[PDB]
């Protein structure tokens, strides 16, 4: 049974946002590029203090009165080996192969700190910035929530699907099940939908360029509309006929494949450089870290932090509860100090590995003038430029297959987990473990695709960026509210 309380509002709005946008894709990019410019240039610092304060809680968790506190109070389900590996595995997606490949070009073209284009000082700081946006520092700002939920799930033995179920000890039962609790759940879902809808906007064009390389078929917006539909079908069949087995295997193979391609690119993409460059960019990270963390550039108005630093932070703000729930669900029976520790390590190892192998590889192709990225981007768009970095490797076809398969099924498990995440939080609380209403699952998977297409239809990265930054604005609060509950609540039932 559905919950009209949280079902109808987002479906209306997300329907409306499509309506106005799809009606005139010219005026949209005149406001898409106007909404983005506003938020980042005046509220960019808000995200950054958020990321430096949640960073404080990390040290407070590890070194506070809750450090040796054990959540759940029993033996863990997983061995540390499997447990760590499950985090290590969760770092594979479509958007990562996308960012892991091209992010270094944008750091090297128009660098931060007023450095010159393609300068050596810019190639120094190039990788080091990826290690910052995707390192132990944003992962640390997830620990407060992953501990929060693992606390609620296991210490307080409750069960939350929607975040409002956590705000009980700050606004009381009156507000929670009232209007206040629905305003946040309507927001959280809408912002979630955009965020997950953008993951498709990044995913499909990667998958289609692989297709264009292996099969020769022309990359068109009409083709992007196909694969998305085929993904809906693939998932619609998978849910209806149970098939929860096969999806898990595919998700397994995606992980084990991800290691092969990384190992591949690392092996033949100059292993000597990558190790050196990494080493050189770890020390460059640690030195400039407080500068990157508090960057706004108000005196030169370069636009770097606003472009990358705050937009990433908005991408991190969003998937907080989304991912912190996951980390909580698996960190059963552990103590909060060893959660935050094994988490940050195991995660960072996954993300650092990708950006250095893929990014350090991309740099070499720019360095050795093998490839002209600015030309490819102006002509065919971003995902083409990325695909050609993969193509500039020995055994291109086997490689492009290796990514094609990867970048494909990585989105299949993305859509399957998405429809689930929504339908559970969209319907009414049935018995836990049960599968969401088969039909409502489908509907969301289609509702996303429309957005994904539109985001592809508008063209460029700006719609993606603006969609997530927008969604990151309310979830800015929602995230703190969930933490403020734990902090308040744990002050009572833990000591």
């Amino acid at each position: 049974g559905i919950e009209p309380k949280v079902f109808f509002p987002p479906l209306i709005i997300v329907g409306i946002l499509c309506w106005l946008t799809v009606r005139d894709l010219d005026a949209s990019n005149e406001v898409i590029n106007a909404v983005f410019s506003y938020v980042t240039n005046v509220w960019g610092w808000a995200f950054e203090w958020y990321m430096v304060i949640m960073f404080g809680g990390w040290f407070w968790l590890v070194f506070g009165r809750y450090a040796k506190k054990r959540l759940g109070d029993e033996k863990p389900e997983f061995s540390t080996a499997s447990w760590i590996f499950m985090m290590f595995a969760s770092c594979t997606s479509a958007a990562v192969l996308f960012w892991g490949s091209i992010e270094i070009y944008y750091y090297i073209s128009s660098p931060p700190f007023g450095m010159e284009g393609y300068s050596a000082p810019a190639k120094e700081i190039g990788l080091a910035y990826s290690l910052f946006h995707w390192g132990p520092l944003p992962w640390a700002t997830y620990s407060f929530l992953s501990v929060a939920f693992a606390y609620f799930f296991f210490v307080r033995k409750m069960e939350v699907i929607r975040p409002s179920s956590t705000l009980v000890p700050l606004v009381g039962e009156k507000h929670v099940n009232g209007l206040f609790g629905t305003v946040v759940d309507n927001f959280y879902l809408v912002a979630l939908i955009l965020a997950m809808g953008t993951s498709l906007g990044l995913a499909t064009p990667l998958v289609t360029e692989c297709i264009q390389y292996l099969f020769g078929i022309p990359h068109t917006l009409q083709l992007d509309a196909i694969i998305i539909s085929c993904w809906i079908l693939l998932n619609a069949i998978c849910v209806a006929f149970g098939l929860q087995k096969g999806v898990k295997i595919a998700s397994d193979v995606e992980t084990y494949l991800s290691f092969l391609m990384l190992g591949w690119v690392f092996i033949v993409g100059g292993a000597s450089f990558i190790v050196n460059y990494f080493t050189d960019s770890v020390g460059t990270l640690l030195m400039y870290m407080p500068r990157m963390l508090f960057y706004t550039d108000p005196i030169g108005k370069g636009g770097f932090p606003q472009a990358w630093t705050v937009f990433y932070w908005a991408w991190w703000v969003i998937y907080a509860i989304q991912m912190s729930i996951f980390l909580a669900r698996i960190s059963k029976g552990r103590t909060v100090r060893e959660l935050c520790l094994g988490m940050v390590s195991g995660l960072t190892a996954g993300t650092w590995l990708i950006w250095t192998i893929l990014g350090g590889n991309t740099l070499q192709l720019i360095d050795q003038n093998i490839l002209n990225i600015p030309q490819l981007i102006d002509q065919y768009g971003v995902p083409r430029a990325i695909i050609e970095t993969w193509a500039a490797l020995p055994l291109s076809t086997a490689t492009m297959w290796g990514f094609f398969i990867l970048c494909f099924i990585a989105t299949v498990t993305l859509i399957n987990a998405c429809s689930y995440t929504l339908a559970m939080s969209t319907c009414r609380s049935m018995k836990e473990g049960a599968d969401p209403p088969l039909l409502v699952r489908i509907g969301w998977s289609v509702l996303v695709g429309i957005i994904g297409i539109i985001l592809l239809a508008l063209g460029g990265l700006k719609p993606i960026q603006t969609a997530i930054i927008a969604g990151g604005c309310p979830l800015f609060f929602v995230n703190i509210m969930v933490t403020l509950s734990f902090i308040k609540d744990a002050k009572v039932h833990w000591k």
Copy 2:
């Protein structure tokens, strides 16, 4: 009853120092600018190691065997809210509005690290340096003494007026009440007198420029002599007729006003920039902090640390016992870890707030070419240039009133507290709580004014700088001696 032991010596010397100086104000500035150049350029590092070693004791206090040690051993007098606020309030003065306004111009004109004048790299480091000289780092070097006195006052239940009363457990009763104990008290008072006499040299010209703006009356040395005298009268009346009520209210209003003007300048002086710039200058601070802390420039001989970094340190060395006593008197019944913590935080919040609002505002006026600071300074002097930064705000007259009143009464409470601090430490130990000999109180307030006038008479900042750096030389030692007592003494009666 007076104490000729400590009364006569300083009165003689300070009388003499006026005599020689006021007799030929040309040769004075030939030695004023010669004494300054010597001390900073060869003993500048001495101050800095002092500030880095006392900084070490902070961490030793917080993380040492004295951390959870409680001084006084009872419930505190104040709630943390009031207690913190009392520190927050103590950051208002006349010299701060002076430095908070113009300090950034000197960092931006001739910057450190060999940077070019008015360069973007210089506007980056501009504010960040103020956050360093007036941040949690110099405040941390007060904690060792504030804990020392709060220890002596409350653990050892004694009562010190003069610092020599603390040196009992390192030189014994023979030296303390002998010649050694008087040499330091004669020094401590003389250096105190100069230091408090310089606070007037910074105060009056601010007050007079406000007068020149609102009333039109010409700023003259003859006018500076008036207000000072009127301040003596205002305080002479206030002490004689009790009036300890009204002074406390005025001191209250000064605080509550200080917030209004800051809030004002912050509201209409571009709140967007100030927040950004602050954020950008916090990260710039943390990154270059060990460089600023150990700066001497021996290879380029630029003269930056000597000019600002060591002169500020000398200003910090002086008011140590002066301020650490204050912090001790109020931190009653607290533990040394929570003193050092709430202190550094509450204080820094007060000082950081000022320098960023006032300094970040001043920069904008330079940036947008609204104002020409170097011209104003060459023509009318510093305090005029500062006044015009305030005048370049919407509702200038209401603003200039808001500062006029502020910058006025801030010096009234400064003179009232001064005469008290001296007369108590100048006379004999009466019953605690009693008011110092009514007449001797007046005499000191006049003895200061003569210096203040002379320091105004000599013109320029150099006499101020040289007067405090000179006073900071002996108090360099005196401060350590008081700490070495606590360290030695606490090793005995605490464990």
Copy 3:
């Protein structure tokens, strides 16, 4: 009685390595300069991660479950005053006067970070780099082994001469006394021999230039062959006739002399600058430290870290067990936290003192154009250039004596301790405290001299550098293996 197990192999190889090298000193420098270029440019990072991971164990020792653990479990033999001083004294040698003098010139000529030659930014970072290569950071990476041995010697009460006697709890008794345990001991000795043979290559030319200055006799390779032989004789007489008394006195005088010459150069070599420069280079160190620690320069290919940073690390990797044994033997009855603490402090104070006095002095001579280092080096070689820095001081002859004597006997105690270190580890385990077989002691002292001569014969620093880097490759492992034993073993008999 000798141990043919570990006697014959190194004697064969080291004999062979002389054979091939001494047969054609032209082709040798074509491979000497080829082996060096390979290892550093591709395995340089291996050394650096080693130095950053062992650096991690330091903090793990101080803050881990072994922190308050006491090794030996009794009162220490030495008072802390003597104990610290014994570390302070151990920092005197011939190679240090060599590196302490000329190292700053190489940092100032062709600086790191792509800085320009003789730039002010290069004179800033000049000293700060010495404080890094010879500071608390490489000393911290010795603590894990010094605690390891002090653990084995005193907790496990065993006695190790050869490192293989420590690998008992990871490869079992089968491997230890088998082939595996001999492969490492053959390696450890060979690499030791080269490392100690290089200390002579640095020592003699210093001693001979002093001779050329005081006595006028021409510096020739034939003369270098003399002094070395005379050193063998001096030690051959010293061992045969007991004389363990006189050697200890000479070693005492060398220490007490070392302070005189440092104090001398510090007194008349501009004490004002040295204090300033030091202060300025401590803050420069702390700021760039993570950059220096993780430097590889893969994007500019300057060659700085490979030249200095990895070659020093290889010099540190080697003397680990050599020096960690020493520190262990004296740190009897102490707790591991107070070992690591007093060690790092007492040591660094010794090394920092030298490089700043000698290096900060050398810089001034370059700065004030008193001396032309590049000309002297091209013409007479390095040790001449160093000698002239000493000669550019007031009372040159008394100074050059002061170094001559120092730089002489410093090598006498170096050869005496060397033959002992080898012969003990070369022969069979007699009763501890006994003197090694009188004859085999001599033989090694000669075997070294041949290398030293050859290393002088090949000319330049490259043979020295290549000899130690080569020896540092296997001992890279050996060092970890000894630590992995302690870590494993202490997990059992300590908790």
